[PDB]
Design a protein around this ligand. Sequence first.
Ligand SMILES: [Ca+2]
Ligand code: NI
Ligand SMILES: [Zn+2]
Length: 423
Amino acid sequence: AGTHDYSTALKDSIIFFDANKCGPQAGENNVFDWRGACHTTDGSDVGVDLTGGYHDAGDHVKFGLPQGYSAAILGWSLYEFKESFDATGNTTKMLQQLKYFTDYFLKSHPNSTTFYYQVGEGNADHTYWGAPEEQTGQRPSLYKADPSSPASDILSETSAALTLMYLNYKNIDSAYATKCLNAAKELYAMGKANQGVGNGQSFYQATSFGDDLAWAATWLYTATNDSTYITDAEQFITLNKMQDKWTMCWDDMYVPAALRLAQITGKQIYKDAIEFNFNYWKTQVTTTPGGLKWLSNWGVLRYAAAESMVMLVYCKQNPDQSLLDLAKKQVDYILGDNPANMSYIIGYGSNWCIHPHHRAANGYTYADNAKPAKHLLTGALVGGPDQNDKFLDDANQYQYTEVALDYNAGLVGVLAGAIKFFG
Ligand SMILES: [Ca+2]
Ligand code: NI
Ligand SMILES: [Zn+2]
């Protein structure tokens, strides 16, 4: 299409998070009238209030790595493209989504050396299909990080999310912002003190933490101007990921970390890492007949949006028309410029997905979970099509209909960037 409404898509992509809010206050200032208080006793098994935060995807477990990653990427979006949010009147709502994340992180850090990062057990949670408000019983505070239990990647992403909140909220509530920075410093300290990846069951199997430590370190530098953090960062990022053939996602933050280090240190090694990844996506990554960069089969649009966001952040200082064109094509494809003639953002554009893999939106139980979703899950980015640009909008095809926090995190960022460069 000659013109696209990036403004409305941005608003919708932010609104999506309201559908996954968890806790006694989940329904407060929530755009969806079908969402209410849920899992109000989280943390009761360990004597700590662990309510709040967000359900991970179509399920209700709160997984630490994607929870932290999502909060960090959303915070990065606001930090780099603030003008886009202000101009479209989305800053207020965005800040509310972010504070819902940070309030949860702070409550999950009872003392300086402890951090609870998973509420719920994946296997059991998935045997349930119904509204989160009616899921009773006891959820276990399954995992926590402490001096004897490492979770460097989770702790670092959470630290980055908290530091970004300090940067994005200091002008609104400096006291709360500082509380976030102090917590961010402590979580980072925990992460480098005992090194190793955190636990995510078989659902979120992590493979690297050096990328996260480096990433968290660059933000602490931006907030404190303390060079020691960069000394740490240069060491952690090298723990060959300098030739990353993947992209930014919950498990791999090597590209974003390299981008910030190139900006902060000016070293060629980091500039080369970014150039490699970008050039790899330009010609090596599979391209569907429809023009979509297809990295892998699961959450394919999530990957295209994430890489595009990184390229747009890079373009702020180093405008490269080849990058802007690539990024714009991926975004436009998601919005409706594709062989399937459908918007991949539910509730936006035309002929959107009617079978999202989301319990709350579905609205049925085991009496009809195969019927079309009863409620409109506005703003959700679905898994996406196959390498032939085909989309199967039906009940059991999860690869196509899955939705998740980490999927939308990158979408918000790229849309904010699109408004700046093409808006
Ligand atoms: Ca990692
Ligand atoms: Ni178009
Ligand atoms: Zn809940």
